[PDB]
């Protein structure tokens, strides 16, 4: 009873997160495009250009590589 109630509370919270988040990503994208024509491409930084390529998402993908191979990779760099 209370457990089904908690699950629903949890789903509510989740929905709100995803909804606020989607809206935000959408506005960020709209704004970026809306001001692009005013951009001085000559002043673009490498960080900016390297950016046009979440932090947590990329981490999990690096975290999966085994310790042995990362070490071996590190020493080969």
């Amino acid at each position: 009873t209370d457990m089904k109630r908690l699950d629903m509370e949890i789903e509510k919270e989740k929905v709100e997160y995803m909804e606020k988040s989607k809206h935000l990503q959408e506005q960020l994208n709209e704004l970026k495009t809306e001001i692009e024509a005013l951009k001085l491409k000559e002043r673009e930084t490498a960080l900016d250009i390297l950016h046009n390529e979440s932090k947590h998402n990329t981490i999990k993908k690096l975290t999966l590589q085994s310790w042995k191979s990362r070490v071996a990779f590190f020493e080969e760099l």
Binding site: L38, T45, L50, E53, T58, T63
Partner: protein, 302 residues
Amino acid sequence: PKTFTVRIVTMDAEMEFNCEMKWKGKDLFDLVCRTLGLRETWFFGLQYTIKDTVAWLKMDKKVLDHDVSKEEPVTFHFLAKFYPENAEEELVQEITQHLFFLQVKKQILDEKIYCPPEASVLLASYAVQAKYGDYDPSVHKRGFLAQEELLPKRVINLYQMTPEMWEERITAWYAEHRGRARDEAEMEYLKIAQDLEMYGVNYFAIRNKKGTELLLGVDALGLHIYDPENRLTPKISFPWNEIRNISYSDKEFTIKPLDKKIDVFKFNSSKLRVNKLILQLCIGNHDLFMRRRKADSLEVQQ
């Protein structure tokens, strides 16, 4: 006995204390935190500058035993030293949240943390809501943000936008935050900032055995290795969970895995004072991380 004057600079303020000659870093630290009404002390530190680097007051050690310059007033910056994994879950007190907010915003405006132009606008709009409260066209009229520092310089000169155009963009988002409380605004700010790739990352120049130049990133998640041409995305990550031990001698670090049979991870760095920093931050963040995994309470490092 005998005191010497210490100047403590916070994100907000400058104040002075009379520090006892016998005091350890923990004494002065606890005195400052109590003065601020801060209980979540584990995140913070007292930072000074020596030569090429910054240094953090060690808790166990007498303040005057530090390589800090003894010319009065001995000056420290009271600053966040360790960043939470998730600010919304871990920053319980208003004062803690507020101090991270000011600091992180300063890192955005100072360009310590890379931030795309569209994001820098969103952040500004939350900072504005935090400072001015709800938007009201009756009151916040054309030019009301004139004397404000809102966007990083890099964003500003990327575009042929005028101050009024930028103010227009910021205000437009500002109006959407209506009814957001000020502490809510600052936490929203921190929530979007913490997802930036450079957020909460301590960068250091290091080398591998071969001697190639690399960047080490020390953060709440682990140790990350970057191509020096790219601070945004590491080539490698050793998360704290895979790490058993961190040791140092003679300009070399040894990172030990959990499996004693696995080869260790080593890097080298020749700047001794910088190495102190690397060692402090590795041990500290590793400890806080392990406390989080065990759902134990956090604890003051050093």
